[PDB]
Amino acid sequence: LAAALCQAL
Ligand SMILES: [Pb+2]
Numbered sequence: 001l002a003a004a005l006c007q008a009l
Pocket residue numbers: 002003006
């Protein structure tokens with residue numbers, strides 16, 4: 001979940 005968000009941003 002944390003990774004997904006870092007990538008998105
Ligand atoms: Pb991250």
